């Protein structure tokens, strides 16, 4: 709910337009964005190209890493700088099995062969990495390393700023839509946005655009609906902006049905990774049962996925779901027994890990430590309840929803190159338009290091594209003017109909942003396999969700906003609604349950490797307002065996 202290209204016709010409436009200054800005700045010199970074907030702390992180989840270690070295083939296998057999191995191997270099730079720039007495990076699990990362983002922000230059960074500007080439319906030409600090409409003209807006959160109703509606495990700041503008432009989406359900500490949603991998913490139901063991038989049906090590994330979730369905909650993370066992009676050893335990939360999700304090929970004495949160749509973590993007020339097989007009690494199906981080689908487990790395990859590819294809799109001023009118329409609608009611937020001719979001969240929660049905859904529910979303989309044309802040909230809602529609249509298309634990189609409860071991790719045609789907059979690209 939002109650503005005072109005801040503007009509489109009275807002000044600022035109910015650049070659490379990066939308989103988070981890993948900063990675793209950094790398682009390096190669751009070959052609004296201009690089522009637009961020809706402030790069210093914007995005998923605002609080910092307690670890770097992707570090292969090909030379032995950490406690554990790994091979790239082993990593690609690991990711594909975790995704239940579906992953663009050409894209996964590509970022993995580059990621370590990014991590090494991170340390060179000042990031404090946990080290052993011998000087090795402390491993959390097999692929992650512990870091003192409270200032993880500010550090990466500084690098990007030094690289691209502050005068090329636009903060507090919200990009709500892309601009396409006036003479080519499948080429990008720039993007439009507005300031949230003053009345100013932006028109960016670019030859290449890189979507780095992060994923989408708040599409589903959280486990807390009051103030805690703001407590989402993933970045509440990411609302699927990239998904919206990209899909609207006609860029094809992939695996958009593949959401991610994280198992975290209850309510505060603190991380469980370090607790499971580093502290060897056990998770048990209300009756002291270790379900990863008591529910081992239920995984046997999945072949070979159920026998993989580690157990695929979705299947790990499946085991907890079964416990929840049997009503064996609360589920506990026995931190007390984990610390005692790890210390082994040594009180000094206990104090050391006790501090490490708290750093794990104070370095990335303070709310959990605050929850502990408010509820008088001392991790060394009593356990903590854990639970799976609501669905999130992203492609950098354990989910692979995002845009279908081209891979490197040396790894991408012909089977995956078919839908791309131009074969540039990370370019979408829309020429000149790249997608990275949460925005690039079918290649997950990138995380902080992986996203920054994927940004570097698209950036270099973008410079190569510009110098090789010499793009020169032209925006359509008629469209720009229509978009400018749409941009501030909510404010104008508010002024036009506010007099119908003595109350600003109870009007028959418009809905405020928070009002439309509550509705979206209810629709998704009840029909799109949300927490309300224990992540279950079926064709009928999904079809009803489309009908309800249709009603909501129509009403978006009647959105109202009382200030710039709410105007951005308005467009963040718009972005979520379309993102949600794509998700629903994608889940409706795939007739199988490949990721039990993430969602279950009760009408097609089994995993189908006979007809569905494929990537589901869709396209939305704005002019025809039609969605088209297709199945791209998965093919193993990298050498590995179960």
């Amino acid at each position: 709910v939002y109650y503005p202290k005072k109005y801040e209204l503007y009509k489109a016709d009275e807002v000044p337009t600022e035109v910015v010409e650049t070659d490379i436009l990066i939308i989103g200054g988070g981890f993948s964005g900063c990675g793209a800005a950094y790398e682009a700045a390096y190669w751009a010199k070959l052609g004296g190209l201009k690089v522009t970074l637009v961020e809706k907030a402030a790069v210093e702390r914007s995005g998923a890493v605002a609080q910092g992180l307690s670890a770097i989840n992707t570090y292969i270690d090909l030379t032995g700088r950490s406690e554990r070295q790994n091979t790239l083939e082993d990593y690609v296998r690991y990711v594909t099995l975790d995704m239940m057999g579906l992953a663009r191995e050409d894209l996964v191997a590509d970022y993995a062969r580059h990621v370590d270099g990014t991590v090494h730079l991170f340390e060179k720039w000042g990031l404090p990495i946990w080290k052993t007495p011998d000087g090795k990076y402390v491993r959390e699990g097999q692929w992650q390393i512990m870091i003192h990362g409270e200032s993880y983002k500010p550090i990466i922000a500084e690098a990007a700023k030094m690289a691209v230059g502050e005068e090329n960074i636009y903060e507090r500007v919200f990009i709500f839509e892309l601009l396409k080439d006036n003479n080519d319906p499948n080429a990008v030409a720039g993007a439009v946005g507005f300031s949230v600090r003053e009345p100013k409409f932006y028109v960016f003209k670019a030859k290449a655009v890189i979507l780095a807006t992060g994923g989408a959160t708040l599409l589903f109703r959280p486990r807390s609906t009051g103030e805690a509606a703001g407590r989402t495990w993933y970045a509440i700041f990411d609302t699927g902006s990239g998904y919206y503008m990209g899909l609207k432009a006609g860029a094809m989406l992939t695996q958009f049905e593949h959401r991610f359900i994280p198992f975290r500490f209850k309510d505060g949603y603190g991380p469980v990774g370090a607790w499971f991998l580093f502290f060897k913490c056990k998770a048990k139901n209300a009756y002291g049962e270790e379900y990863i063991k008591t529910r081992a038989a239920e995984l046997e049906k999945y072949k070979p996925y159920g026998a993989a090590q580690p157990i695929p994330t979705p299947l790990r979730n499946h085991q907890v779901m079964l416990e929840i369905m049997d009503g064996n909650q609360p589920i506990y993370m026995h931190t007390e027994e984990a610390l005692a066992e790890l210390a082994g009676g040594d009180k000094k050893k206990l104090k050391h890990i006790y501090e490490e335990a708290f750093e794990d939360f104070l370095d990335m999700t303070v709310s959990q430590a605050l929850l502990w304090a408010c509820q008088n929970i001392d991790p060394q004495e009593q356990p903590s309840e854990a639970a799976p949160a609501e669905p999130y749509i992203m492609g950098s973590h354990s989910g692979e929803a995002g845009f279908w993007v081209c891979g490197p020339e040396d790894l991408m097989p012909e089977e995956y190159a078919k839908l791309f007009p131009l074969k540039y690494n990370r370019m979408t199906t829309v020429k000149g338009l790249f997608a990275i981080g949460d925005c690039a689908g079918a290649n997950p487990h990138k995380f902080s290091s992986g996203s920054f790395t994927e940004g570097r990859i698209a950036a270099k590819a973008a410079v190569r594209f510009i110098l090789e294809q010499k793009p020169n799109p032209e925006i359509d001023d008629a469209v720009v003017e229509e978009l400018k009118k749409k941009a501030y329409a909510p404010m104008e609608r508010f002024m036009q109909y506010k007099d119908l009611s003595t109350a600003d937020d109870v009007n028959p001719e418009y809905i405020l942003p928070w009002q439309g979001l509550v509705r979206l969240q209810k629709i998704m929660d009840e029909y799109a396999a949300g927490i309300a049905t224990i992540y279950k859904t079926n064709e009928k529910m999904l079809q009803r969700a489309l009908e309800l979303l249709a009603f909501l989309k129509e009403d978006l044309e009647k959105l109202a906003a009382r200030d710039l802040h709410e105007l951005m909230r308005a467009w963040e809602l718009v972005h979520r609604v379309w993102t949600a529609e794509a998700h629903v249509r994608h889940m409706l298309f795939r007739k199988e349950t490949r990721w039990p634990g993430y969602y279950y189609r009760t009408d097609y409860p089994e995993l189908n490797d006979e007809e569905w071991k494929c990537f589901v790719c869709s396209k939305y045609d704005a002019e025809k307002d039609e969605w088209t789907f297709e199945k791209v059979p998965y093919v193993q690209v990298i050498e590995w065996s179960f």
Partner: protein, 149 residues
């Protein structure tokens, strides 16, 4: 969510910009031009990231756990420096914990983005190598990955 202490907030009127307003990733912190004091404009959209809390030079901002699940009394207070950060965790029952973690091993603003990197070249632009590779990776050669036969 975050909240501003009136007695401590001076509206950053002795600074070139308002710290909290500048830093908030969700555009929640703003100034009440009447009082010349900051306030969270939309608390239920607060992620409790503590960015505002850490950047307020007057230490006027704190966080009061979401009412949905937080009993009154708890608090986490940070004192961020240049190389490390201090935390005081105060329990509802009165227990007080203190911690200190490193946050950076180099001076702020000292990053030279491409230190030691050779200049980019048209030829290099056509390879799979990113800036500083393959050496920043730790190997003399670009990492190879076996393709499936």
């Amino acid at each position: 969510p975050s909240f501003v202490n009136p007695e401590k907030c001076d509206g950053c009127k002795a600074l070139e910009r308002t710290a909290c307003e500048y830093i908030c990733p969700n555009d929640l912190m703003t100034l009440d031009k009447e009082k010349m004091k900051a306030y969270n404009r939309e608390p239920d959209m607060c992620w409790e990231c503590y960015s505002c809390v850490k950047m307020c030079p007057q230490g006027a901002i704190d966080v009061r756990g979401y009412v949905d699940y937080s009993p009154l009394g708890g608090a986490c207070v940070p004192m961020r420096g240049t190389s490390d950060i201090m935390w005081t965790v105060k329990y509802r029952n009165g227990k007080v914990l203190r911690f200190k973690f490193a946050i950076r091993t180099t001076p702020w603003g000292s990053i030279q983005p491409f230190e030691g990197f050779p200049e980019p070249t048209e030829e290099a632009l056509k390879s799979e190598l990113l800036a500083g590779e393959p050496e920043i990776i730790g190997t003399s050669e670009f990492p190879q990955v076996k393709k499936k036969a």
